[PDB]
Amino acid sequence: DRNVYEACSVVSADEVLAEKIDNAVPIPFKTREEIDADVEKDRNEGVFEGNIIPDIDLRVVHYYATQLCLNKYPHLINAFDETSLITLGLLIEKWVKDYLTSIQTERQSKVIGKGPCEFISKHIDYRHAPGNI
Amino acid sequence: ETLKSANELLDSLEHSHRVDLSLHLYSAYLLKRLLYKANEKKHFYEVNQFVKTQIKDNWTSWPNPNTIIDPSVDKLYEDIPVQPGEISNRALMHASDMMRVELDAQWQKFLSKSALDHDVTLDVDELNIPNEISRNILVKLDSLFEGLHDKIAKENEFDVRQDKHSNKYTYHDLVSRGCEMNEDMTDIYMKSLELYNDIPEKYKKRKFRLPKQILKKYHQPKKTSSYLKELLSKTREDFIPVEKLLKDKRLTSKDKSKLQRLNREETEDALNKRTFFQVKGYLEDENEISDYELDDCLIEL
Amino acid sequence: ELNDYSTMIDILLSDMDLETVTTKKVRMALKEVYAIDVESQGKAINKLIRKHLDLVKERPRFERSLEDLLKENATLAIELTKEI
Amino acid sequence: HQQLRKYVELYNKEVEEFYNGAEFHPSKVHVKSIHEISSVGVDWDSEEKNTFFWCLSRYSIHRVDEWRSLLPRKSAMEILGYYRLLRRASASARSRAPIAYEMSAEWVALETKLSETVMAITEGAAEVADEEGHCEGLIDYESWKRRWVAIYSHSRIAEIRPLPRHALPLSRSATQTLERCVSRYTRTLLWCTALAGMASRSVSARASLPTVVTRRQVERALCTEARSRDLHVLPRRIVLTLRKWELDYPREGKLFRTKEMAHLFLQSQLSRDEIDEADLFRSALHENQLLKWLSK
Amino acid sequence: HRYKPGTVALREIRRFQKSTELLIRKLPFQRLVREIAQDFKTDLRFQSSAIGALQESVEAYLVSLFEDTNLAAIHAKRVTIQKKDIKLARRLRG
Amino acid sequence: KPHRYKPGTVALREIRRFQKSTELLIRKLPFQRLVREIAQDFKTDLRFQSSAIGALQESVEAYLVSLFEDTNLAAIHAKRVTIQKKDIKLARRLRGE
Amino acid sequence: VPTLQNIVATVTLGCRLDLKTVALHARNAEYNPKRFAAVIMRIREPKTTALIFASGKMVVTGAKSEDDSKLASRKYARIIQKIGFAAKFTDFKIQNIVGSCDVKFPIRLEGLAFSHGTFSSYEPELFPGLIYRMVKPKIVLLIFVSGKIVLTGAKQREEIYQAFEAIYPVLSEFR
Amino acid sequence: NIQGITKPAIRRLARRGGVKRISGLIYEEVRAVLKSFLESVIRDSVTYTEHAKRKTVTSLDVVYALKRQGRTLYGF
DNA sequence: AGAAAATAAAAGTAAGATTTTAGTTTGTAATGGGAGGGG
DNA sequence: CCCCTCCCATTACAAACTAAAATCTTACTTTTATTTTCT
């Protein structure tokens, strides 16, 4: 193909890229489990928290950015690369988590605590009242 | 027998491996970065031509008038709040609807993880992201792109006006844009360092050396008179931008190859330092001016 | 300062009907007009209202219209400027 | 004859209430709270409920992103969630607003006299003017004095119409703050122009690839930057100053001395109400109780 | 025992109604919105929700202005705000 | 103490006079040292053209002119005889910090 | 040590379900009895797919964890109940947990075919990997050429970890 | 028609901002601020509508119009 | 206390000298198309 | 088809220049604001 978006929409994008370079060098594929395995030492030290690779569906972000730019911002055609899309997912995840974090102490930390969970809490006793669900 | 179940198990793993785009975008980044590092000290011209002509920029560049790929995720679930290739407001409204689906998944994932840590059972009828909150996040995302577009449009008008009077974005830019929107990007910057700097250092560059066959394909002409020294001596301006100097036809291929290698090394250090400070913020002096407070208003006789 | 607050209570009671007067209502009016903090020495403050509320049953109820208020406000304002 | 001290306490108590303004029993707030055994939800303390309702009046719920710092243990979901329940409850509740009292023209005349008298006594406690600043400092105050006598003394603003010929002196503590202010803005300016182009290297022709800042890049950064960056442009400031002070100046001649800065200005520009009668009566009574209090 | 959501007291509802009530009447504000649209030679039509959104953002702006206006009066050691106080706040903000 | 009871006309000469580089509020040499010191924080070989420093000076001087104008307006509002620190703090407060 | 991917939970609804009506009421569930006699619907956040039978038995698929499967099962039961069929959430049972890990050491699978061929089979035509069945604990595992050992058929996390620990030394050697 | 915003509306709005007493001559000045701010939001709302090629102004257009001014609005 | 007169400060008017800005010329480097070769 | 070196025509533009507009120096008159005398 000519894109990684079409290649990710039996042959994977890795195979397309490998034949795009005539298999000159191995394709460096890193799964989510391996990515977290190479940052566990720094994760333990607390230098950062959460996942470094976004869990949001970047295809949905790409389609929205495509429609938004092709309708209002025609100067942004082909203006981004792979790292921009990955970072965009991390930033969008940050915006959602912003609405849930609070200053909680145990020194103080800006984390998700008691509040949001209890605000929508529901105690269920399925042994005697299975109809609550 | 169990082979059909095993075959279905294998197909699901392959299907999941294909669908996710983040790891494929990352693999493209790691391939280009590892190729340059293993082949920058020698054969920089070959690897630069090899990367630029085979792993083209349009492999991951976006958005395009082409590749209008509809995920169509609003027709798959119910736990949620157009002709193909169409570009219209109906498609834009359709795109926003699936964006709210993605935000809802993040909202529910965050709460569920927190509830387990704090040992709280959640009511499944209220896990939906509030409509007012999601509408605000979409406005933020829309404002992020219009800020980038506005700068380009204003810069073009500035260049046009001066001309009449006289007569690419990476994760560094996305971090900088977030700082312009008065967001705290310290956490994302730390995560970006691990993903783009710390992880690729684990790879062994010996595995990514270009083979002899590829090296012979992209040979550059040799024994050609260099013009950079003569060009620099006769120039009028004290400093010449690299981008202007790279496109000048008075420089040989070998002259540009050495400049491109130096530019790539220096830009990466400059880009790393630039986003490091932008994340830190300009208020490092800490000589804060006190605000208008209660003490400044009271009267004593 | 306790005697000073007594004058404030006397002024407030002279212009409100006594049918629905409550110790909380006068205490609220003290903060609304004179911005005095009622939370501190609240128990002492409440004693003054109750003490003053017994004394206002003697005189009768006089109601003055907007015109009477306007002309007397002008008299007080211009007079107060002269002492300054 | 003690209205001066009575006014001072009235002013001081009002100022404290305006600043330290932020009753309600503690309760648990849940998304299913409906109308006016254990309770479930999130704990909303009395100081939290008081802060929430005071913040709601002073700033709309739309500015919750700012004043949510006054509720450190409450996330934006909980604050916006609480607002959602109350809106549902209020619309579903059986029906049945503080006002600002309109003061007479005679009252404000008295208050202005009282305020002016107070500033006269308190003027002795103000910090005194500095001696002199020299060339070591960034700011040259001699130029400012020359500006005021030549530009700002001609202002036609009615409320400040009698204007002093010479600019007001500055205290030593004031000058230090101004010196710190320009240093803070210089960092802001450098981080918008010099740091932005940090990644664009050049070749040292008249000898590594350095980074070079040019007037072309600085003017481009000033004009094409976001207006929230509060970056100032000198030719734009001149026209704004003349409008702000309502100065009369000729319009036929050229405002700017050079074509370059005149061009820079062009680049920046293109880049029977019964409610009323009740309020009048309450205001007249409110003024009456204040005048009687002072007349004592 | 019964796990029940915490009830909102009636005094909380009244305070919320006091804080978030739209003080400007809808009909006079609607007419002003229409006049501006026709004064712009604009044929666009405003939805009722759009008019409501315009109104509820106007109150937030006006309250913020009055907060700054009070600071000007405080600076002059005054307890009432005058016309000159609003003029000073407008000049400095703009 | 002296007052101008008739606001005249601001002629173009003194409007143009303070647009000169020598008439700017910000001083040449101290601003250069300040710019270099701040630029020294960026650990890179960063260089300024002579005209680039001047262009930054006009922008900085524009900010100081605006700050002085608002500080004096606040001082006139309070009928001060000497501009105080809180006059600067009020102007910044009313400017959105 | 290995990371699980798929979780299938067994949840029985006390009421009797009408597949035709629930499909119409559901927004995106697709039902066609000609091929399959179950209603298919998916939820976004847990990324779980549930099979809904007319008999009331429901099996979900795609949970990343046992607890997430319970949360996903609750939402699936809640959706069915919201239709109005008075379903009940009873007898939650995890029936199979699938886990896998990557040893990062390319290992040939031909040798394991004949070194221990009694309980292990390697049909290259039928499957690209090697079928390996070890007795205790009862987890079925497959050997691949790259070394992505997958495990399936366990019950909980304690058993699935011990299965990897038993086969960890085996995968390290036999290059 | 700017007179539609009556005196009691301004008096109650001033109290919300912490202002306890007003001069009584500020009503005309506040109305000028009232109209001037309303001009900007309506202008940007119409401008955002043309860029979307729509024939009406909705609450979202006003929300986007206020976002360009750095002001947030919540669509409850 | 207020006005009216006196005095001094300020601004306005003018011309000639001198500085600053604006227009022109001119040299040559800068810029981009193009041919030609080579794979 | 895309790479390269080389050509060459045009255009950009800084440096030098000329010129015209602005402004500074000197001197003067006239309007404006401060202070003294007077009622």
Numbering used by the authors:
A (entry chain F): 2 to 10, 20 to 116, 119 to 145
B (entry chain E): 35 to 115, 123 to 208, 227 to 360
C (entry chain G): 3 to 86
D (entry chain D): 3 to 24, 31 to 44, 55 to 114, 121 to 231, 239 to 302, 339 to 363
E (entry chain A): 40 to 133
F (entry chain C): 38 to 134
G (entry chain H): 64 to 238
H (entry chain B): 26 to 101
Q: What did the study's authors say about this model?
A:
The yeast transcription factor upstream activating factor (UAF) represses Pol II transcription and mediates Pol I preinitiation complex (PIC) formation at the 35S ribosomal RNA gene. A six-component protein complex, UAF comprises subunits Rrn5, Rrn9, Rrn10, Uaf30, and histones H3 and H4 (17, 18). We found that UAF recognizes DNA using a hexameric histone-like scaffold with markedly different interactions compared with the nucleosome and the histone-fold-rich transcription factor IID (TFIID). In parallel, UAF positions TBP for Core Factor binding, which leads to Pol I recruitment, while sequestering it from DNA and Pol II/III–specific transcription factors.
Using cryo–electron microscopy (cryo-EM), we determined the structure of the complex and found that UAF uses its histone fold–based structure to recognize DNA and that it interacts with a conserved regulatory surface of TBP while sequestering it from DNA to enable specific Pol I recruitment. By cryo-EM, we found that UAF contains a hexameric histone-like core, composed of subunits Rrn5, two histone H3, one H4, Rrn9, and Rrn10. In the refined structure, UAF occupies positions −85 to −54 of the DNA, whereas TBP is held away from DNA by UAF. Consequently, bound DNA is translated ~10 Å away from its canonical position compared with the nucleosome. At the Rrn9 contact site, spanning positions −65 to −54, a helix-turn-helix–like element runs parallel to the DNA, making contacts with the DNA backbone at both major and minor grooves and donating one base-specific hydrogen bond at position −57. Combined, the two contact sites of UAF bury 1673 Å2 of solvent-accessible DNA surface, spanning 33 bp of DNA. At the N-terminal lobe, Rrn9 and Rrn10 contact a conserved regulatory surface that is also contacted by TFIID and TFIIA during Pol II PIC assembly and by Brf1 during Pol III PIC assembly. In addition, the N-terminal helix of Rrn9 engages in hydrophobic interactions with the DNA binding surface of TBP. The structure of TBP in association with UAF is therefore permissive to higher-order assembly with Core Factor.
